[PDB]
């Protein structure tokens, strides 16, 4: 009865060897060939001109927002249903998160609720691509265009997804990714900013390397950060990136298994809706439990654990947690409902059909 | 003639082994054995109860200040002569750096200039142990206690140093260290906070880990950061620490060669003064050029370079660079003088007596 983990990394390419070179060469810091190579390759992978390697997906967002000039006073629209760093990133800038409702099916920012939230202080919108699925960008871009707003994609959970022929990371003014341990591709901890804007790219690199002038060593023209990725993180990321497609394929296999087995559950869960706008990379396989259940989402998590199956609740809405309770509105209903009923199911490259079978059997038993 | 670099990581212990283990077991993110082991060993090496591993020494500083509650309106006294991360860290809290001059001999915070800088807003004093030498702690602690201020040691360059029987890191309310690539101990990029106070340590672990309750996964009681160290960085760190005494001895030898051979340069340099307060670990061997010279400090660095020898200027005082020029005062004269004539010479564990001979001969050639 081996436990089943919601996530896990699969280092099945050149990771070990590339890490070895770093070690052998003594290039373990924030300078080395893999950083540039990883940035170049990631940039190509997304179809953009620039890729900026960061220490994590959280600092990437911060660094991206600061480079964009988000600061005190400014409002950034962010979905209440998201991972907390989306909101915190805005907060670190001294700026103000303005929460917006999501779609009840895709879990993503509802473009129809944006216009109403725009004010004289709005500067940007941060669509977050939940669970490997790109928000409906066209409408979002169109609203930003109309209001002269920046669009920053939090693409943390979406490496590889596409929207109407474009890869995540290539849609807003800039985008951020995470390579945290459980991500589609990992570096253990690591992040990336993508953009086509030369000027934003330069300011990002300037702020990443402590605010030091790249053309005047030891001289610091602005206040910056230490947000650099190491050559080792870059080594692991490059090797992961080389097998991105294989990694992508493995999740699709796992997802195909859930999808072929779901009737066993009936109307007891609603399977994740796939918008027909491009590839959904399924960082996580997310269901919405039946309101009709006597049991609670939280109990269900406890019961699956008891059956050695790991699962987690969908992100608690920002506005229901202490840091952002004050940002609550009466127009965050869908987010609340998903926060109530949402359940992330184990989705990782190493899960087997038998494991998926176990997961379904347990849900069948616990969904009461 | 290979080039002589000012610093360089000596990975001549178990770094490779420990790292390979992380790769082979897949533990390459911010959870794992090495993290806890490294924190454990480090806390013991410093003689304190807690050590909190972070992704760098700059975020370490930020994290510790936030944990001690530094925020908007507060003032922290920081020497103008330091690496800019010292001041930036306060800046990130939205607090105000209050610059103080240093000793002309040790390059450290001048305790005698502290009191007059204290105001109703002061919350803390940040002594920085430059070049591996601990500031004169007792007088500084004397002033702080009298004014009920916190003390936070920026111990980035002084792992291993001691002061009147105590290791760097055990002296203030908390302290920070850097394992950047050129540091006494390196993890490539890495940092650590040390403290004896249980609650400060807990709050520090709370913030480090995205502000998530260690007791209620997925729940976020406060706004935190992503400042965690990877298991890979901790693995390197632990292997470095296992050989800390050898690393320091190596530097001692090198320093000894300097002490002996520097005679050849006569009054053309002023050798680093060493306080008899405890061990000066010599992150860098720092001279101040003779006033009698006709050459300039920047020119000597260029001439050494052309001769294949790396050196660097003593840090530029904060108040003379754009970000902090607004905090300039007329009582920062020693820091300005040191910045003008200060030169860091190669100092690292891989240097031979011959290498040192070479640096001195080059200095004999360029100090005109
Ligand atoms: O780049 C950093 O984060 C620190 C730089 C530093 O300590 C140095 O160059 O001596
Ligand atoms: Na002179």
Provide the CATH number for the domain around residue A296: 3.90.1150.10
Looking at the structure, tell me whether residues A145 and A262 fall in a common domain: no
For chain A, the C-alpha Rg in angstroms (whole number) is 21
Q: Considering CB atoms only, which of B56, B84, B220 is closest to A220?
A: B84
Output the six-digit token pair for B333.
């004269």
Looking at the structure, tell me whether residues B37 and B135 fall in a common domain: yes
Contact B107, B314 (CB under 8 A): yes
> What was the resolution (in A) of this experimentally determined structure?
1.8
Ligand 1 center–CA A151 separation, angstroms: 33
Closest alpha carbon to B173 in B39, B62, B64, B54: B64
Q: What is the DSSP letter of B2?
A: -
Q: Which residues of B touch A232 (CB under 8 A)?
A: 19, 188, 232
Nearest atom, ligand 1, residue A228 CA: 3
Query: Which chain A residue shows the shortest CA-CA distance from B220?
Result: A321
Q: Which residues of A touch B344 (CB under 8 A)?
A: none
Q: A with B: how many residue pairs have Cβ under 8 Å apart?
A: 152
- Other C-beta atoms closer than 10 Å to the C-beta of A256 total 12
CA dist A10 and A185 (Å) reads 9
Contact B160, B184 (CB under 8 A): yes
Token look-up 């770094």 returns B15
Least distant ligand from the CA of B55:
1
Exposure of A215 in the CB half-sphere (CA atoms within 13 A): 1
Token look-up 């790292």 returns B19
Closest alpha carbon to A176 in A243, A287, A88: A88
Output the six-digit token pair for B277.
């307060």
The Cα-based distances of B282 to B80, B162, B247 in angstroms read 21, 12, 11
Looking at the structure, tell me whether residues A20 and A136 fall in a common domain: yes
Least distant ligand from the CA of B85:
1
Token look-up 């911010």 returns B30
CA dist A205 and A195 (Å) reads 12
Q: Is the CB of A29 under 6 A from ligand 1?
A: no
Contact A35, A187 (CB under 8 A): no
| Interface contact flag, B189 A84, Cβ < 8 Å | no
Dihedral of the alpha carbons of B92, B98, B102, B106, in degrees to the nearest 10: -30
Looking at the structure, tell me whether residues B158 and B252 fall in a common domain: no
| Phi, psi dihedrals of residue B153, rounded to the nearest 5° | -80, 125
Strand B150-154 relative to strand A96-100: parallel, antiparallel, unpaired? Answer: unpaired
Least distant ligand from the CA of B300:
2
Q: Is the CB of A211 under 6 A from ligand 1?
A: no
Output the six-digit token pair for B318.
């904060």
Closest alpha carbon to B127 in B61, B189, B184: B61
Closest alpha carbon to A99 in A120, A70, A72, A128: A128
CA-angle at B233, arms to B229 and B235, nearest 5°:
120
Output the six-digit token pair for B329.
């005062």
Helix (H, G, I), strand (E, B) or coil at B275: coil
Looking at the structure, tell me whether residues A154 and A296 fall in a common domain: no
Exposure of A193 in the CB half-sphere (CA atoms within 13 A): 32
- Other C-beta atoms closer than 10 Å to the C-beta of A263 total 7
Contact B184, B155 (CB under 8 A): no
| Interface contact flag, A16 B29, Cβ < 8 Å | no
Handedness of CA A39, A40, A41, A46 (dihedral sign): positive
Q: Which residues of B touch A322 (CB under 8 A)?
A: 220-222
Looking at the structure, tell me whether residues B174 and B48 fall in a common domain: yes
Q: Spell A115-151 as b/e; 16+ CB within 10 A means b.
A: eebbeeebbbbbbbbbbbbbbbbeebbebbeeeebbb
- Other C-beta atoms closer than 10 Å to the C-beta of B320 total 16
Token look-up 């001289």 returns A219
Contact A127, A140 (CB under 8 A): yes
Query: What is the length of chain B?
Result: 368
- Other C-beta atoms closer than 10 Å to the C-beta of B190 total 31
Residues in contact with B277: Cβ distance below 8 Å, sequence separation at least 6, in sequence order: B134, B136, B137, B163, B164
Residues in contact with A307: Cβ distance below 8 Å, sequence separation at least 6, in sequence order: A358, A362, A365, A366
Output the six-digit token pair for A230.
């190491």
Burial class of residue A274 (count of CB atoms within 10 Å of its CB; 0-12, 13-18, 19+): middle
Q: Is the CB of A5 under 6 A from ligand 1?
A: no
Alpha-carbon B21 to chain mean position: 29
Query: Which chain A residue shows the shortest CA-CA distance from B219?
Result: A321
Strand A174-178 relative to strand A166-167: parallel, antiparallel, unpaired? Answer: unpaired
Question: What residue owns the CA closest to ligand 1's atom 4?
Answer: B180
Helix (H, G, I), strand (E, B) or coil at B89: helix
Query: Which chain A residue shows the shortest CA-CA distance from B237?
Result: A28
| End-to-end CA separation in angstroms for chain B | 24
Pocket mutation for ligand 1, best pick of B61, B158, B180, B181 (most atoms within 8 Å of C-beta) = B180
Q: Mark which of A243, A263, A281 sits at the end of a domain.
A: A243
Burial class of residue B340 (count of CB atoms within 10 Å of its CB; 0-12, 13-18, 19+): middle
Handedness of CA B59, B63, B66, B70 (dihedral sign): negative
For chain B, the C-alpha Rg in angstroms (whole number) is 21
CA dist B242 and A150 (Å) reads 49
CA dist B21 and A291 (Å) reads 46
Token look-up 């995540």 returns A168
Which ranges of chain B does DSSP label H, i.e. alpha helix?
A: 15-25, 33-46, 57-67, 85-93, 137-146, 198-208, 231-241, 244-261, 297-306, 333-341, 353-366
CA dist A236 and A15 (Å) reads 5
Q: Mark which of B212, B243, B274 sits at the end of a domain.
A: B243
- Chain B contact probe: residue of A54, A90, A176, A188 with most B CBs at under 10 A: A188
Handedness of CA B32, B36, B42, B44 (dihedral sign): negative
- Other C-beta atoms closer than 10 Å to the C-beta of B141 total 17
Looking at the structure, tell me whether residues B88 and B118 fall in a common domain: yes
CA dist A156 and B252 (Å) reads 47
Question: Domain range for residue A235?
Answer: 1-100+107-243
Contact B111, B84 (CB under 8 A): no
Q: Considering CB atoms only, which of B11, B186, B225 is closest to A58?
A: B225
CA dist B66 and A223 (Å) reads 18
| End-to-end CA separation in angstroms for chain A | 23
Q: What is the DSSP letter of B313?
A: E
Residues in contact with B149: Cβ distance below 8 Å, sequence separation at least 6, in sequence order: B118, B122, B123, B124, B125, B143
CA dist B92 and B95 (Å) reads 7
Looking at the structure, tell me whether residues A35 and A162 fall in a common domain: yes
- Chain B contact probe: residue of A15, A26, A95, A342 with most B CBs at under 10 A: A26
Closest alpha carbon to B183 in B27, B9, B338: B9
Closest alpha carbon to A93 in A123, A69, A58: A69
CA dist A206 and A226 (Å) reads 10
The Cα-based distances of A46 to A156, A196, A333 in angstroms read 13, 11, 34
Q: Which residues of A touch B189 (CB under 8 A)?
A: 29-30, 55, 226, 228, 230
Query: What is the length of chain A?
Result: 368
Q: Which residues of B touch A58 (CB under 8 A)?
A: 210, 225-226
The Cα-based distances of B302 to A319, B298, B306, B367 in angstroms read 57, 6, 6, 12
CA dist B44 and A316 (Å) reads 39
Helix (H, G, I), strand (E, B) or coil at B145: helix
Contact A271, A290 (CB under 8 A): no
CATH number of the domain bearing residue A164: 3.40.640.10
Q: What is the DSSP letter of B180?
A: B
Q: Give a three-class secondary structure readout of chain A.
A: CCCECCCCCCCCCCHHHHHHHHHHHCCCCCCCHHHHHHHHHHHHHHCCCEEEEECCHHHHHHHHHHHHCCCCCCEEEEECCCCCHHHHHHHHCCCEEEEECECCCCCCECHHHCHHHCCCCEEEECCECHHHCCCCHHHHHHHHHHCCCEEEEECCCCCCCEECCEECCCCCCEEEEECECCCCCCCECCEEEEECCHHHHHHHHHHHECCCCCCCCCCCCCCCCECECCHHHHHHHHHHHHCHHHHHHHHHHHHHHHHHHHHHHHHHEECCCCCCCCCCCCCCEEEEECCCCCCCHHHHHHHHHHCCECCEECCCCHHHCHHHHHHCCCCCHHHHHHHHHEEEECCCCCCCHHHHHHHHHHHHHHCC
Ligand 2 center–CA B84 separation, angstroms: 27
Looking at the structure, tell me whether residues A250 and A354 fall in a common domain: yes
Contact A218, A212 (CB under 8 A): yes
Helix (H, G, I), strand (E, B) or coil at B257: helix
Closest alpha carbon to B131 in B107, B165, B154, B101: B107
Q: What is the DSSP letter of B228?
A: B
Output the six-digit token pair for A73.
């006073």
What's the domain count of chain A?
2
Contact A163, A139 (CB under 8 A): no
Looking at the structure, tell me whether residues B19 and B44 fall in a common domain: yes
CA dist A212 and A235 (Å) reads 25
Looking at the structure, tell me whether residues B173 and B258 fall in a common domain: no
Q: Mark which of A208, A243, A278 sits at the end of a domain.
A: A243
Q: What is the DSSP letter of B346?
A: P
Q: Which residues of A touch B305 (CB under 8 A)?
A: none
CA dist A200 and A202 (Å) reads 6
CA dist A322 and B98 (Å) reads 33
- Chain B contact probe: residue of A13, A53, A94, A189 with most B CBs at under 10 A: A189
Looking at the structure, tell me whether residues A201 and A125 fall in a common domain: yes
| Interface contact flag, A88 B316, Cβ < 8 Å | no
CA dist B5 and A232 (Å) reads 22
């Amino acid at each position: 009865l081996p436990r089943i983990s919601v996530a896990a990394p699969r280092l099945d390419g050149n990771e070990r060897d590339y890490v070895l070179e770093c070690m052998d060469t003594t290039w373990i810091s924030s300078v080395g060939r893999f950083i540039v190579e990883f940035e170049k390759a990631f940039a190509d992978y997304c179809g953009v001109k620039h890729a900026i390697a960061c220490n994590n997906g959280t600092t990437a967002l911060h660094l991206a927002l600061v480079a964009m000039g988000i600061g005190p006073g400014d409002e950034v629209i962010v979905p209440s249903l998201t991972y907390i760093a989306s909101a915190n990133s805005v907060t670190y800038c001294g700026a103000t998160p303005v929460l917006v409702d999501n779609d009840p099916r895709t879990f993503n920012l509802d473009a129809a609720k944006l216009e109403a939230l725009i004010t004289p202080r709005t500067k940007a919108i941060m669509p977050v691509h939940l669970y490997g699925q790109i928000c409906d960008m066209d409408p979002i871009l169109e609203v930003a265009r109309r209001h002269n707003l920046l669009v920053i994609e939090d693409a943390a959970e979406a490496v590889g997804a596409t929207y109407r022929g474009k890869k995540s990371g290539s849609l807003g003014d800039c985008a951020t990714f995470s390579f945290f341990g459980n991500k589609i591709i990992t570096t253990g901890e690591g992040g990336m900013i993508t953009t086509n804007d030369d000027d934003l790219a330069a300011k990002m690199r300037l702020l990443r390397g402590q605010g030091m002038d790249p053309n005047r060593r030891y001289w610091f023209p602005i206040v910056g950060f230490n947000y650099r990725m190491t050559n080792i993180q870059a080594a692991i990321g490059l090797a992961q990136l080389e097998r991105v497609d294989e990694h992508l394929a493995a999740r699709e296999r796992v997802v195909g298994w859930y999808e072929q087995k779901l009737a066993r559950l009936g109307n007891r869960v609603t399977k994740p809706h796939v918008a027909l706008t491009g590839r959904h990379v399924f960082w996580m396989y997310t269901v919405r439990l039946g309101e009709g259940l006597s049991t609670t989402r939280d109990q269900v998590i406890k019961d699956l654990d008891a059956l050695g199956i790991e699962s987690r609740p969908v992100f608690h809405p920002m506005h229901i947690m202490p840091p952002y309770a004050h940002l609550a509105t009466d127009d965050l209903k869908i987010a609340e409902a998903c926060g109530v009923d949402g359940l992330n199911l184990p989705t990782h490259a190493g899960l087997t059909e038998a494991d998926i079978d176990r997961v379904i059997a347990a849900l069948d038993q616990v969904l009461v």
